[PDB]
Enzyme design. Structure first.
Site, PDB file in Angstrom:
ATOM      1  N   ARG A  54       0.848  -1.180   0.000  1.00 22.44           N
ATOM      2  CA  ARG A  54       0.000   0.000   0.000  1.00 22.44           C
ATOM      3  C   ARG A  54       0.886   1.231   0.000  1.00 22.44           C
ATOM      4  O   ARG A  54       1.623   1.471   0.959  1.00 22.44           O
ATOM      5  CB  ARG A  54      -0.928  -0.005   1.205  1.00 22.44           C
ATOM      6  CG  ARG A  54      -1.682   1.270   1.355  1.00 22.44           C
ATOM      7  CD  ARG A  54      -2.633   1.182   2.516  1.00 22.44           C
ATOM      8  NE  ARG A  54      -3.626   0.135   2.313  1.00 22.44           N
ATOM      9  CZ  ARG A  54      -4.349  -0.411   3.280  1.00 22.44           C
ATOM     10  NH1 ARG A  54      -4.200  -0.047   4.543  1.00 22.44           N
ATOM     11  NH2 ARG A  54      -5.255  -1.334   2.970  1.00 22.44           N
ATOM     12  N   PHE A  59       1.098  10.588   1.603  1.00 22.80           N
ATOM     13  CA  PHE A  59       0.819  10.091   2.947  1.00 22.80           C
ATOM     14  C   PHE A  59       1.859   9.085   3.420  1.00 22.80           C
ATOM     15  O   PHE A  59       2.666   9.421   4.290  1.00 22.80           O
ATOM     16  CB  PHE A  59      -0.594   9.506   2.994  1.00 22.80           C
ATOM     17  CG  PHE A  59      -1.671  10.545   2.853  1.00 22.80           C
ATOM     18  CD1 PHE A  59      -2.033  11.341   3.929  1.00 22.80           C
ATOM     19  CD2 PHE A  59      -2.304  10.744   1.637  1.00 22.80           C
ATOM     20  CE1 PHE A  59      -3.017  12.306   3.799  1.00 22.80           C
ATOM     21  CE2 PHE A  59      -3.288  11.709   1.499  1.00 22.80           C
ATOM     22  CZ  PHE A  59      -3.644  12.490   2.583  1.00 22.80           C
ATOM     23  N   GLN A  62       3.410   1.511   3.050  1.00 24.05           N
ATOM     24  CA  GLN A  62       3.113   0.476   4.035  1.00 24.05           C
ATOM     25  C   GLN A  62       3.492  -0.899   3.496  1.00 24.05           C
ATOM     26  O   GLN A  62       3.339  -1.179   2.305  1.00 24.05           O
ATOM     27  CB  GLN A  62       1.623   0.528   4.425  1.00 24.05           C
ATOM     28  CG  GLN A  62       1.122  -0.632   5.276  1.00 24.05           C
ATOM     29  CD  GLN A  62      -0.298  -0.411   5.760  1.00 24.05           C
ATOM     30  OE1 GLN A  62      -0.846   0.680   5.622  1.00 24.05           O
ATOM     31  NE2 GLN A  62      -0.901  -1.449   6.326  1.00 24.05           N
ATOM     32  N   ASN A 101      -1.918  -1.371  12.240  1.00 21.27           N
ATOM     33  CA  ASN A 101      -2.712  -2.243  13.093  1.00 21.27           C
ATOM     34  C   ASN A 101      -4.160  -2.274  12.627  1.00 21.27           C
ATOM     35  O   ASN A 101      -4.564  -1.558  11.713  1.00 21.27           O
ATOM     36  CB  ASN A 101      -2.619  -1.806  14.562  1.00 21.27           C
ATOM     37  CG  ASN A 101      -3.227  -0.439  14.804  1.00 21.27           C
ATOM     38  OD1 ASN A 101      -4.405  -0.213  14.526  1.00 21.27           O
ATOM     39  ND2 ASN A 101      -2.427   0.481  15.320  1.00 21.27           N
ATOM     40  N   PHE A 112       4.439   1.299   8.508  1.00 22.39           N
ATOM     41  CA  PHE A 112       4.386   2.296   7.452  1.00 22.39           C
ATOM     42  C   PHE A 112       5.439   3.367   7.679  1.00 22.39           C
ATOM     43  O   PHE A 112       5.878   3.610   8.806  1.00 22.39           O
ATOM     44  CB  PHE A 112       2.988   2.918   7.329  1.00 22.39           C
ATOM     45  CG  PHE A 112       2.527   3.682   8.544  1.00 22.39           C
ATOM     46  CD1 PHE A 112       2.032   3.023   9.662  1.00 22.39           C
ATOM     47  CD2 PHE A 112       2.540   5.070   8.545  1.00 22.39           C
ATOM     48  CE1 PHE A 112       1.581   3.738  10.767  1.00 22.39           C
ATOM     49  CE2 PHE A 112       2.091   5.787   9.643  1.00 22.39           C
ATOM     50  CZ  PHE A 112       1.610   5.122  10.753  1.00 22.39           C
ATOM     51  N   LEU A 121      -3.055  10.178  13.175  1.00 17.99           N
ATOM     52  CA  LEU A 121      -2.711   8.825  13.591  1.00 17.99           C
ATOM     53  C   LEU A 121      -2.045   8.782  14.961  1.00 17.99           C
ATOM     54  O   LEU A 121      -1.866   7.689  15.511  1.00 17.99           O
ATOM     55  CB  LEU A 121      -1.793   8.182  12.551  1.00 17.99           C
ATOM     56  CG  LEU A 121      -2.424   8.098  11.159  1.00 17.99           C
ATOM     57  CD1 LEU A 121      -1.445   7.519  10.164  1.00 17.99           C
ATOM     58  CD2 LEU A 121      -3.702   7.269  11.212  1.00 17.99           C
ATOM     59  N   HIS A 125      -1.345   4.714  16.520  1.00 15.85           N
ATOM     60  CA  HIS A 125      -0.275   3.909  15.942  1.00 15.85           C
ATOM     61  C   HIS A 125       1.031   4.187  16.668  1.00 15.85           C
ATOM     62  O   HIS A 125       1.377   5.339  16.937  1.00 15.85           O
ATOM     63  CB  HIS A 125      -0.145   4.183  14.439  1.00 15.85           C
ATOM     64  CG  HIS A 125      -1.375   3.818  13.671  1.00 15.85           C
ATOM     65  ND1 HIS A 125      -1.529   2.601  13.039  1.00 15.85           N
ATOM     66  CD2 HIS A 125      -2.541   4.483  13.495  1.00 15.85           C
ATOM     67  CE1 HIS A 125      -2.724   2.547  12.479  1.00 15.85           C
ATOM     68  NE2 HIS A 125      -3.359   3.675  12.746  1.00 15.85           N
TER      69      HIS A 125
END
Ligand SMILES: CCn1c(-c2cc(N3CCN(C4CC4)CC3)cnc2[C@H](C)OC)c2c3cc(ccc31)-c1csc(n1)C[C@H](NC(=O)[C@H]1[C@@H]3COC[C@@H]31)C(=O)N1CCC[C@H](N1)C(=O)OCC(C)(C)C2
Ligand SMILES: CCn1c(-c2cc(N3CCN(C4CC4)CC3)cnc2[C@H](C)OC)c2c3cc(ccc31)-c1csc(n1)C[C@H](NC(=O)[C@H]1[C@@H]3COC[C@@H]31)C(=O)N1CCC[C@H](N1)C(=O)OCC(C)(C)C2
Ligand SMILES: Nc1nc2c(ncn2[C@@H]2O[C@H](COP(=O)(O)OP(=O)(O)O)[C@@H](O)[C@H]2O)c(=O)[nH]1
Ligand SMILES: Nc1nc2c(ncn2[C@@H]2O[C@H](COP(=O)(O)OP(=O)(O)O)[C@@H](O)[C@H]2O)c(=O)[nH]1
Ligand SMILES: [Mg+2]
Ligand SMILES: [Mg+2]
Lengths: 163, 168, 163, 169
Positions: A54, A59, A62, A101, A112, A121, A125
């Site tokens: 991903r 951003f 991942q 997660n 990531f 986040l 995270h």
């Protein structure tokens, strides 16, 4: 002293470059140790050969699913998943390394790398490291991502270890 | 968070819309002809010191589907209006794209940039003065590009971002 | 008399099923023969092993690039390209088999199978056959298409020939 | 040329939006949890003898992004509002989605279907009666589904198309 690990990234099997991370053992020892051991493969399993599944420009990138290679798997060295160690460190900008997660206390192996500040986040995270060399490799991976994160080429951790 | 800009590359079939877009996003020239159905790309860039996210829609120029453009014209913020320097028809078609965008968006000042692509080729059939004049009317910039050499590629997309900025 | 050929379709190497086609040699003999010989490979090259690169649900499935395997290639048994034979037959409904092209008289090996009427292609693409058996397999192929035709699984002609 | 229907599947994280949609599109049950960012699918179907094209938007239920739903709600023609019959919280989230969709469309008359998913599971916490009542109060259909067994999967999407056709005549 905080350990340092590296990923050698390849794109469709073609070498791209090396990225290295400082792991903040001083603040999150259990989470850093998981990433460290998975980077060396010393438990018999780890990140080598896995892909970034991903990648969303603007951003993050991942990866870390080495059990299923489809974005749903991965496991820690402590069992399949382990608890959130703490949320001391924040997602302050590009290069932050943090755990993926599926809700509270579900850390495994997926992680990531931020390519921008992702403050929403924070507290959800566990941040445990940062890129130390090769941020431009991470930026180069962005050009193979898309809006929903699907990649247009296979971005693999061709090799990894501890420095 | 960084601002998102929704850019749309329009123009006649084969003028180089994807060649320019793929140069911007992936930094290589596609010499083969892979006609587009519809594609979307994302890139974060820094323009004049502001980080921003480019959302780029690569469209199809086949005339069979010219009645199906209204929706992406409504949703788009700025438009890269591409013709090819060696294709008179494509320059003619550029007029209808502009008129169609103004029509659909009901505005004379839709962020827009005129792009004369394939400028590396010999036997140009549409010289810079008429393109310049056409751009003087409408009231928009004009940039000559080559997706083969990558000349003007960044300038073309970054200039369109600057037009959206001036508008909003 | 019109020949019948078949494709055995696979999905990521897994067999899916067989589609068979009647080729309308009684109206377009040159075009029907091209597809026939390419389905047998009797000339040394053809469809065996090639993929369906573009599958758009509600419209069609397109394939035939066995030279570049990227959606831009293909060739006929007559050379790189041959002329539009005629437009006698029309895109009347599902199952129609017709030639892809990049403008007038640029037929090679690329083809498409309609899953719906596509009357706006009439007079521009040469219709030369129709699905005889296995339309359910063509419909099943649509499971893995998208709006712009990019496929989510590799759809191959695992085998093909004449019946 | 067949009609296209723009369906949007909404609901809390993990209720089975993608499982339901993949069952519809690919006749496959996703056993694993692969949380969605955003995905789009297409399928042509025959509903009440009329062939049509379903364009399905599969959305993300993560609460951090609840303020970013306006764009897809403005474009969608009909909404599958999914909860899981073994997750009372997801049932409570439904009201939020419905109010949000009504607000964005500025209409009391938006095609929706209420879907109680995971009806194969024995740990039911949301009564069928309680879901039926809510659907009655909203004026919309309610269908219990299982992405695992395929129960009601076609029915839910086809019923939503019927709701749209009724709003269109
Ligand atoms: C509504 C759209 N949308 C966005 C988003 C948002 C924004 N902004 C938000 C912030 N605003 C600022 C204050 C103003 C501006 C608007 C813009 N555009 C978008 C996108 C591109 O529009 C298509 C996102 C996002 C994220 C999710 C779902 C939808 C999302 C989502 C689903 S699951 C998850 N998130 C956690 C996930 N879990 C797993 O993968 C589990 C798998 C199974 O168990 C192991 C493994 C996880 O840990 N990570 C590791 C960390 C980043 C995270 N994924 C991720 O991908 O986020 C991506 C993204 C783009 C950062 C956020
Ligand atoms: C505007 C969007 N849009 C649509 C379309 C249209 C509609 N309808 C139109 C008609 N209305 C009714 C009468 C009212 C209703 C609305 C709905 N939704 C859509 C799509 C899904 O929105 C994203 C299309 C379509 C087609 C093209 C470009 C854009 C398109 C296009 C580009 S090149 C080509 N077409 C011919 C191509 N050439 C090559 O591949 C060359 C490569 C190089 O040299 C060898 C090799 C070729 O031969 N074929 C073999 C044949 C089908 C054909 N491809 C194809 O894929 O069309 C797909 C599609 C979906 C059927 C048409
Ligand atoms: N010489 C030259 N050829 C180009 C240039 N841009 C595009 N082409 C070619 O023109 C053809 C069509 O390009 P393409 O981007 O697919 O056209 P589109 O339909 O507008 O997307 C390709 O063969 C490209 O290689 C250019 O700047 N110079
Ligand atoms: N037993 C059962 N499990 C389901 C059902 N639907 C979804 N699941 C599971 O529930 C989890 C979440 O499903 P998912 O579709 O990803 O949730 P989403 O966030 O709403 O898209 C997955 O592990 C699915 O396998 C169902 O009808 N029955
Ligand atoms: Mg193109
Ligand atoms: Mg989902």
């Amino acid at each position: 002293v905080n350990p340092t690990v590296f990923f050698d990234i390849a794109v469709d099997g073609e070498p791209l470059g090396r990225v290295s991370f400082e792991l903040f053992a001083d603040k999150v020892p259990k989470t850093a140790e998981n990433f460290r051991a998975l980077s060396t493969g010393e438990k018999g399993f780890g990140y080598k050969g896995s892909c970034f599944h991903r990648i969303i420009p603007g951003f993050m990138c991942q990866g870390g699913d080495f059990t299923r290679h489809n974005g749903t798997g991965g496991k820690s060295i402590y069992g399949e998943k382990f608890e959130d160690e703490n949320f001391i460190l924040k997602h302050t900008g590009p290069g932050i390394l943090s755990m993926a997660n599926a809700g509270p206390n579900t850390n495994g192996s997926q992680f990531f790398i931020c390519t921008a500040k992702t403050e929403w986040l924070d507290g959800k995270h566990v941040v445990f490291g940062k890129v130390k060399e090769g941020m431009n490799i991470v930026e180069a991976m962005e050009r193979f991502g898309s809006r929903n994160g699907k990649t247009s080429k296979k971005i693999t951790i061709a090799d990894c270890g501890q420095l | 968070g960084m601002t998102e800009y929704k850019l749309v590359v329009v123009g006649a079939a084969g003028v180089g819309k994807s060649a320019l877009t793929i140069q911007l996003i992936q930094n290589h020239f596609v010499d083969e002809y892979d006609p587009t159905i519809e594609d979307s790309y994302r890139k974060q860039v820094v323009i004049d010191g502001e980080t921003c996210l480019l959302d780029i829609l690569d469209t199809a120029g086949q005339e069979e589907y010219s009645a199906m453009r209204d929706q992406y014209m409504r949703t788009g913020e700025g438009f890269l209006c591409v013709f090819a320097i060696n294709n008179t028809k494509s320059f003619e078609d550029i007029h209808h794209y502009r008129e169609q965008i103004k029509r659909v968006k009901d505005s004379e000042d839709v962020p827009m940039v005129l792009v004369g692509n394939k400028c590396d080729l010999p036997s140009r059939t549409v010289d810079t003065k008429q393109a310049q004049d056409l751009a003087r009317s409408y009231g928009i910039p004009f940039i000559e590009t080559s997706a083969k050499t990558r000349q003007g590629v960044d300038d073309a997309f970054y200039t369109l971002v600057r037009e959206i900025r001036k508008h909003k």
